Nucleic acid binder design. Structure first.
Ligand SMILES: Nc1ncnc2c1ncn2[C@@H]1O[C@H](COP(=O)(O)OP(=O)(O)O)[C@@H](O)[C@H]1O
Ligand SMILES: [Ca+2]
Ligand SMILES: [Zn+2]
Length: 613
DNA sequence: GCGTCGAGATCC
DNA sequence: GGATCTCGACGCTCTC
């Protein structure tokens, strides 16, 4: 499995390794990086599957530096292009972009530079619409191609009027290699991407999509106190760190933001109800940690944000699909540092999302109900490892269920925290009871749970009243939720006089199958320091961060593009002002110590006494 | 008009 | 600390 691509004896190895160490300041290759770098430098077409934060950028940026000529990178978002170019400029790697969001005089200047004997530009980032609308671009690529200075085509996020366009590039310039990258976890989509690009004999580099540093939690939601719960959890676990709070509605964003602001927390709301410039202002404040620590957002927020130091993502209400949850929680810890993914769950939010699906135009309504049901299952599954649940959902099996046990510092709540019964007789009695009391039904799920348990609060004291005497309230609630998810029972939403969605229970499509036929129902029962030096290291880190923020203002660059969180962390841990020591740190380079070194070394020299333990 | 949530009051 | 009942507010919808 790519054994030939594991060699460090190729004619290219020496210049490649020197660029790895001297330009990038790196020391060790991550999974499949060396293999993909070697394959690309040999002129092989590559297909790379890595999760977010895996290190996909190096796979084309290191070869781009080694190769003579220009590596053309096709990317869909202007913001992701701007951020990549900032990283490369910071490292003194000649890079630029053409997105339309460039002056006509400035774009013409990029074409002028590209047509020179030595184009100098190693990486050119383009938007997919430039492949079709820019004759000036294609004529420039034609010129580079005739001169053997078109090194590679990169499709940074491979994900209609995009794929036929990338195929146009291959037909126009067939001898230039192609590298395609994707972070999509969906195994059928990974196959569709690979077959659709139709690349000749591709080298395919894939790996586990398990984000080792993401700690997944699901907590019961107290709807009237969720904002105070988020607030307390933030001040206890991440008072000085950036985060996102995902909320179901625009009003809930404004409420969440207002509550946090009243406690002195720098929080801002982000939803489509805001103007485009107001949204842009919120996003920039949040990325730069400048007047915004917490973004309280609807699904309107996300696409095109690569902030590497998000320490928490809180879902104040569950999302509408597992894919959405995976993408939203996935915004956390892109730098590999421990980050938290916390979801506040209540079944009441499920029927709030069910009324959102009932407001749409259609089979597509049944699809969204199914996707939602898959998300409710993840919430209700308080037994299986949260990592294994998400991975199994995206066709990744064989994964170690002992991961959260082997690495307890990044454990999910299910691994930190079981029987079985043939309840078919009980469900047959529930089904015959809701048949007789079938807005389309007479009772809600809560009413049904009271009756079943034989509660004094029950609205009827006959039929199934007390039938569930052997179940606890928690198990009776779980039993009824299971029947709705299993389509044995169904819910009809009724809008009351206060615009509240009320779910009345009726028979589902599988009710006649449980009684008439024999659909056996199985239910499973459940029950629910410090050091003087370490403190100085912590103090030095805050100072080092402030340095990057002031340098960021003067260079017109995001602070994390000066030095990332891992580099900053390691720099603070060293407490050294000696370059010989600083150059062994990942991301520390001669070019960066020249640019930023004076400001960085002046902070480190103040901790001179604590350098040696 | 009425379902739902959560605080307050019971007994364990 | 639960478990269980009763009373009294308060109730509201996501993306190009
Ligand atoms: N071999 C490596 N050693 C150390 N850091 C690395 C290495 N490869 C990548 N990184 C860093 O890991 C982080 C995530 O990489 P990135 O290219 O942005 O990931 P992706 O595109 O897969 O989401 C970046 O900060 C990057 O500089
Ligand atoms: Ca990327
Ligand atoms: Zn686990």
């Amino acid at each position: 499995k790519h054994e030939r691509f594991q060699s460090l004896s190729f004619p290219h190895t020496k210049e490649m390794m020197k660029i790895f160490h001297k330009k990038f300041g790196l020391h060790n290759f991550r999974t499949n990086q060396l293999e993909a770098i070697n394959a690309a430098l040999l002129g092989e077409d590559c297909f790379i599957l890595m999760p977010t934060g895996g290190g996909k950028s190096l796979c084309y940026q290191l070869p781009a530096c080694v190769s003579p000529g220009v590596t053309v990178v096709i990317s869909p978002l202007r913001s992701l292009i701007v951020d990549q170019v900032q990283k490369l400029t910071s490292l003194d790697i000649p890079a630029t972009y053409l997105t339309g969001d460039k002056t006509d005089s400035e774009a013409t200047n990029i074409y002028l530079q590209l047509s020179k004997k030595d184009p100098i530009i190693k990486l050119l980032y383009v938007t997919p619409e430039k492949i079709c609308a820019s004759n000036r671009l294609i004529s420039t690529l034609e010129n580079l191609y005739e001169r053997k200075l078109l090194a590679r085509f990169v499709i940074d996020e491979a994900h209609r009027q995009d794929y036929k366009r990338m195929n146009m590039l291959r037909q126009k310039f067939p001898s230039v290699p192609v590298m395609a990258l994707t972070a999509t976890a969906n195994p059928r989509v990974q196959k569709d991407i690979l077959t659709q690009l139709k690349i000749l004999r591709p080298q395919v580099f894939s790996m586990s999509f398990n984000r080792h540093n993401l700690k997944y939690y699901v907590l019961p939601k107290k709807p009237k106190k969720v904002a105070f719960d988020c607030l307390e959890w933030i001040r206890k676990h991440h008072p000085y760190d950036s985060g996102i709070i995902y909320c179901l509605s625009r009003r809930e964003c404004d409420t969440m933001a207002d509550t946090l602001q009243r406690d002195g927390l720098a929080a801002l709301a982000y939803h489509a109800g805001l103007s485009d410039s107001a949204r842009d202002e919120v996003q920039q404040k949040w990325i730069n940690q400048d007047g915004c620590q917490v973004i309280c957002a609807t699904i309107a927020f996300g696409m095109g944000i690569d902030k590497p130091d998000v320490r928490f993502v809180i879902h104040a209400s569950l999302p509408k699909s597992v894919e959405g949850y995976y993408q939203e929680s996935g915004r956390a810890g892109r730098d590999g540092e421990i980050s938290h993914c916390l979801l506040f769950y209540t079944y009441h939010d499920v029927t709030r999302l069910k009324r959102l699906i009932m407001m749409e135009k259609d089979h597509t309504r049944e699809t969204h109900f199914n996707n939602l049901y898959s998300m409710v299952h993840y919430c209700e599954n308080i037994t299986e490892c949260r990592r294994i649940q998400l991975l199994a959902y995206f066709g990744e099996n064989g994964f170690n269920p002992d991961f959260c046990k082997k690495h307890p510092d990044v454990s999910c709540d299910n691994c930190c925290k079981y029987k079985t019964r043939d309840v078919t007789d009980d469900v047959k009695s529930i089904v015959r009871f809701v048949q007789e009391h079938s807005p389309s039904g007479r009772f809600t799920m809560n009413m049904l749970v009271d009756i079943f348990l034989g509660s004094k609060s029950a609205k009827i004291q006959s039929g199934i009243f007390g039938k569930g005497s052997a179940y606890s309230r928690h198990n009776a609630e779980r039993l009824f939720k299971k029947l709705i998810l299993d389509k044995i029972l169904d819910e009809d939403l009724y809008i009351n006089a206060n615009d509240q969605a009320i779910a009345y229970v009726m028979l589902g499509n599988k009710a006649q199958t449980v009684l008439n036929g024999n659909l056996k129902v199985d239910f499973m029962e459940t029950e629910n320091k410090v050091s003087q030096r370490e403190e100085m290291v912590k103090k030095c880190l805050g100072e080092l961060t402030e340095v990057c923020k002031s340098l960021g203002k003067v260079f017109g660059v995001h602070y994390f593009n000066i030095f990332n969180t891992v580099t900053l962390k390691k720099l603070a841990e060293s407490l050294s002002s000696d370059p010989e020591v600083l150059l062994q740190i990942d991301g520390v380079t001669e070019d960066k110590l020249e640019k930023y070194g004076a400001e960085v070394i002046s902070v480190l020299q103040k901790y001179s006494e604590w350098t040696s333990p």
